[PDB]
Nucleic acid binder design. Structure first.
Lengths: 50, 96, 176, 109, 198, 128, 137
RNA sequence: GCGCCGGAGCCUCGGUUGGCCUCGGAUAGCCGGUCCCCCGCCGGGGUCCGGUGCGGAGAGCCCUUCGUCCCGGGAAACGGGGCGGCCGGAAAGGGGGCCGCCCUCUCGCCCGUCACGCACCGCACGUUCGUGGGGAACCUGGCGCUAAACCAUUCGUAGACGAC
RNA sequence: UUGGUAAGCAGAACUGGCGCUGCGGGAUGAACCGAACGCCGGGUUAAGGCGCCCGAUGCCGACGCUCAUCAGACCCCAGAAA
RNA sequence: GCGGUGCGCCGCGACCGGCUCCGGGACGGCUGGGAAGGCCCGGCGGGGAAGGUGGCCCGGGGGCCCCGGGUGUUACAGCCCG
């Protein structure tokens, strides 16, 4: 049960199943994708160990 | 809120003999004796003085309706000594 | 907001990005209270957006280093000021405590307003945390501990540790 | 001249309210009442001991009634003293509230 | 193997729940002195809630109906039935280890234990009201209070006289202590060193 | 486990018995030696895992422990009978051990007796 | 009824938790249910609940608040150390904790002292009974 | 032919692996002593002394088991061991101990000297309560016991037939 | 969001369900909350729970509020104000 | 002997590698180049008042000591800031 804009944006980040993750570089086109899926994800700025 | 200490002191004359065992205060004076218990109250009825000439009632950590009890026990031991000293005597008239 | 753990106390100064119309725009500093830095900067964007014309598409944060107590052994009467939202309106306030940390007071507070008013920490602000003196204090409860030679006994010591035998020979004691 | 095992009581299967799992048991080891306490018992051999109508042969004895199911303590369970298990032969539910022996032998002292 | 439990100052809904569990593990249990089990909240709340129980009678043939027992033995028993899976074989059987009596008849030359968690002193504040399943039973038509009293009175008379003797027993050991303690110097100073007396 | 400490054999026809340690063989098994006299246990192997170790250590630095008693010499053959080879191996390996057990204050009423469980007396609590 | 007080002065033993089994003084009653330290016996100036601390009956005199050097000259003055080794309290602390020390080979050598200590008394308990009978003729 | 008292095997049902022989109860207060004294029939208060995070503490108390032989030390010398007075006890009555004897050992309980005992060759149900419950039969003596019920026939204080 | 005092009533927009669909949870059940399924061994979880019934607080879990002769105990939900 | 194939039924141990849950020792960086506290009333130098130490009187109870008030800035205690 998922709204048809969000299925398209989660596809484009290749997150197609639960508890899956990806690297993503940042800019304006990259954040405003991540405000449309911002109750299906968790993201943050990773370190040299993570 | 929870008021830390509360107390009051009753003091006997040159006439009467009182003591206790827990909170069950006995009294004998010039015309009888009387036992009254108070074992339903949570207090410290400590006696003090040489020739035991004052009772004293504490009540640590209390809310509103248990600092009430302090003076009501303080004024039940008043009607035990005033009845054993002088003694009680109601009167009444027949009406028609 | 959730008021989890204890609250830290934070300094988070936050100006706006210098647009070219006049070279330098003003800085604006605030004591926030929060358990981590993520809710010490995004909750700070709810208080500054109401005073100035300042949301988040133009707006940076310069500092967010934790502030510490500096008499964290000493007892202190705090005088905290409150604002809160009822079901039927809105209210301002003054509200006192005792602790050893500016932070700890605020925390104590969000737990009292939970108890006497069924207010949840998103209907609740601290407008002015302020340390206060002894004879100045107004309210009854916190006054009575202004007694140097304090002498109270711990009377009816309700017993803890009740599944340590589980069954036993002795009925317990409760006066120590 | 005495006992060499510790007493315990099979007290249901591993389960949540409405579906039960039969490949794991749930023992209440005697006098052990937190987690802290239950390192000892881990890995250590265990036995359900019983008695059918006919004669089973033994090793070190004559052919008689008495038989066993054999098993193994695996990990702690909960907050309060309890323990999980894994016998080779899945247990009867007759044995619920009846005795089992944990041994002392594969010791780590 | 068998547990005995003076339920004096022991609460209704709880002992219940601590007892029922022992039972299901396989212990056998005996409660005794049910005419002292108490219940929190004041007697006109324990008489009403109890009365209104009486009212549930199958309307069309009341013989079959919800069987209301009266005695403080059968009452406690009922509230332990309530916390057991009683229409299965494993419940039915677990009730057979439970055995519970009036007065303290037989099972009285025994040390009998106490649960401190379901204990009144521990569990209720001292400015709160409470009933006795004793009186409560005698004010919903129990027909033997004053007999289970007069019997009991008897047995405290006969406890005192035993206790009496078993202190004097202690008056010819604690003295002998002193009438041997020079010629038991080395079997009295080699226990100390691990701590089984002092 | 170190040489000379006290071991509790927990499994064979001897079980619960107080038995002394001598030397780990190169098969990895122990040498649990009873002083045949006191327990009723001779030269034998037992297996690390089925032997509790104990806090008591009378020293076994200065005596003699034989070589030819090596791990195959124990290994099985086929009314097995105690031949006249294992009778100077019996009393000479143990009469060097026996002057150091009786010298301690009251230790030869304890190797002889057997340990066992009772109640209040739980494996997980006590130190032994 | 009351004789042991939360008294600016008191020493309390510590029932449980972290600094368990250490004495520690009183300094600063914050609150209704939490006070504020113990310098000779390895405890750091820090607030503490009351639902952990059992009262001993030692009170030492310093002002109602002072730092860790002025409480040094009020605890090294009464000499609390010495005087909490005599306490009948702390011998039933060290004739209880000597039982958790205890080995196997001690348990059993205490057991042979306990089998020839209540045979002499067990003999001498019967020679005071059958002489009490002798009197009352 | 049933039933009390004192050897040799078979079917069958399974559970368990040492005992606690007891004040009355307070909880803002207990417990133990000996009590000089006053009221009671051995007993209750009062007075004085210990102790109180129970140490006269269920954070407790008891019993404790590889076996024998020779020689000493301690403890015991009022002990260990197996025929009879006489009471104990009713709420759902316990395989209770005081007093003679037939008798009987110098052992039993702790620390030593004296060696021997399937030493079965590294391993699983191992050790009890147990002479356990239920019952087909076989005994061997000892003490001694030959009834009612169902029905049919009759009554009418009863009845549809059964019951009474 | 239109009619109707309102209806578990008549009628339309956007998305997502049910019908065709079992599984944890809400005692109870087409639509509500979690997650969508080949046969099984270890491991950790969601939403929900941790007195007994029933897996899991048998933590020396924190600070307050409340007595009821009709107390109180969880999204849709199943009793009500001036 | 050297190579392959496995045991009649029931069993134990050892070291190797994949996956998990745990337990224990040590080491560096940061900050307000952490915050506070510790030890030589730190050594000279002023000020301030209370949850008033000395002491001085008044009240109020006993064998020279506690209890209930007032006075006021170091005396036979402490406390906050250069």
């Amino acid at each position: 049960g998922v709204s048809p804009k969000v299925r398209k944006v989660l596809q484009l980040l290749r997150l197609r199943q639960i508890f899956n993750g990806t690297f993503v570089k940042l800019n304006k086109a990259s954040i405003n994708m991540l405000r449309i899926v911002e109750p299906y994800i968790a993201w943050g700025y990773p370190n040299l160990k993570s | 809120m929870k008021t830390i200490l509360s107390n009051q002191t009753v003091d006997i004359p040159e006439n009467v003999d009182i003591s206790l065992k827990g909170r069950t205060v006995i009294v004998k004076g010039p015309r009888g004796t009387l036992r009254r218990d108070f074992n339903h109250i949570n207090v410290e009825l400590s006696l003090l003085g040489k020739k035991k000439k004052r009772l004293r009632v504490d009540k640590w950590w209390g809310n509103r309706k248990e600092l009430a009890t302090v003076r009501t026990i303080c004024s039940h031991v008043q009607n035990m000594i005033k009845g054993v000293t002088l003694g009680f005597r109601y009167k009444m008239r027949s009406v028609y | 907001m959730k008021a989890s753990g204890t609250l830290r106390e934070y300094k988070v100064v936050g100006r706006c990005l210098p647009t070219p119309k006049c070279r330098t725009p003003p800085l604006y500093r605030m004591r926030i209270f929060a358990p981590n830095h993520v809710v010490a900067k995004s909750r700070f964007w709810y208080f500054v957006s109401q005073l100035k014309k300042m949301k988040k598409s133009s707006g940076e944060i310069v500092y967010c280093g934790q502030v510490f107590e500096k008499s964290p052994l000493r007892v202190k009467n705090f005088g905290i000021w409150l604002r809160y939202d009822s079901r039927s309106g809105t209210h301002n306030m003054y509200r006192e405590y005792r602790d050893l940390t500016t932070a700890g007071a605020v925390t104590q507070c969000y737990r009292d307003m939970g108890a006497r008013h069924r207010a949840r920490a998103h209907s609740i602000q601290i407008m002015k945390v302020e340390e206060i003196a002894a004879s100045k204090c107004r309210r009854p409860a916190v006054k009575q501990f202004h007694d140097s030679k304090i002498k109270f006994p711990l009377p009816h010591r309700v017993l803890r540790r009740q599944h340590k035998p589980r069954f036993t020979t002795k009925r317990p004691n409760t006066f120590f | 001249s005495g006992r060499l095992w510790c007493k315990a009581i099979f007290a249901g299967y591993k389960r949540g309210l409405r579906n039960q799992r039969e490949h794991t048991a749930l023992l209440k080891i005697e006098g052990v009442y937190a987690r802290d306490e239950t390192e000892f018992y881990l890995g250590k051999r265990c036995a359900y001991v019983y008695k059918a109508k006919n004669n089973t042969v033994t090793p070190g004895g004559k052919p008689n009634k008495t038989r066993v199911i054999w098993g193994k303590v695996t990990r702690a369970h909960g907050n309060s003293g309890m323990v999980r298990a894994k016998f080779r032969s899945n247990l009867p539910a007759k044995a619920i509230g009846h005795r089992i022996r944990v041994m002392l032998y594969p010791s780590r002292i | 193997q068998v547990l005995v439990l003076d339920g004096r100052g022991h609460l209704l809904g709880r002992l219940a729940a601590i007892v029922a569990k022992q039972v299901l593990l396989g212990r056998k249990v005996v409660v005794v002195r049910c005419e002292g089990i108490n219940i929190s909240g004041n007697f006109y709340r324990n008489k009403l809630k109890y009365l209104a129980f009486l009212r549930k009678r199958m309307n069309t043939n009341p013989s079959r109906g919800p069987y209301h027992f009266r005695a403080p033995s059968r009452i406690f028993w009922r509230t332990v039935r309530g916390m057991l899976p009683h229409k299965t074989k494993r419940g039915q059987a677990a009730l057979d280890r439970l055995k519970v009596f009036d007065g303290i008849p037989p099972y009285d030359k025994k040390k009998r234990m106490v649960v401190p968690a379901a204990l009144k002193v521990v569990r209720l504040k001292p400015t709160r009201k409470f009933a006795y399943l004793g009186r409560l039973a005698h004010e919903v038509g129990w027909k033997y209070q004053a007999v289970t009293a007069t019997l009991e009175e008897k047995r405290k008379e006969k406890a005192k006289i035993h206790y009496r003797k078993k202190k004097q027993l202690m008056r010819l050991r604690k003295q002998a202590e002193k009438n041997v303690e020079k010629k038991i110097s080395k079997f009295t100073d080699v226990l100390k060193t691990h701590g089984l007396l002092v | 486990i170190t040489p000379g400490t006290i071991l509790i054999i927990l499994t064979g026809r001897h079980r619960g018995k107080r038995v002394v340690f001598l030397k780990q063989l190169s098969s990895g098994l122990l040498l649990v030696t009873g002083p045949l006299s006191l327990n009723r246990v001779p030269l034998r192997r037992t297996h690390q895992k089925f032997v509790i170790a104990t806090s008591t250590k009378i020293d076994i630095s200065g005596v003699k422990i034989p070589k030819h008693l090596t791990d195959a010499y124990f290994k099985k053959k086929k009314k097995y009978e105690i031949t006249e080879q294992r009778k100077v191996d019996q009393k000479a390996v143990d009469s060097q051990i026996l002057p150091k057990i009786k010298a301690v204050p009251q230790l030869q009423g304890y190797l002889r007796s057997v340990f066992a469980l009772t109640n209040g007396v739980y494996p997980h609590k006590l130190v032994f | 009824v009351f004789r042991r007080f939360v008294e600016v002065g008191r020493v309390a033993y510590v029932s449980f938790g972290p600094h368990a089994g250490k004495l520690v003084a009183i300094v600063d009653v914050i609150d209704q249910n939490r006070a504020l330290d113990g310098p000779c016996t390895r405890v750091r100036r820090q607030a503490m609940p009351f639902k952990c601390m059992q009262l001993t009956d030692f009170i030492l005199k310093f002002p109602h608040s002072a730092r860790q050097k002025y409480v040094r000259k009020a605890w090294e003055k009464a000499d609390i150390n010495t005087k909490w080794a005599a306490t009948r309290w702390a011998k039933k602390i060290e004739a209880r904790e000597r039982k958790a020390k205890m080995t196997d080979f001690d348990r059993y050598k205490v057991m042979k002292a306990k089998k020839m200590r209540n045979r002499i008394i067990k003999n001498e308990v019967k020679k005071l009974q059958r002489a009490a009978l002798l009197k009352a003729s």
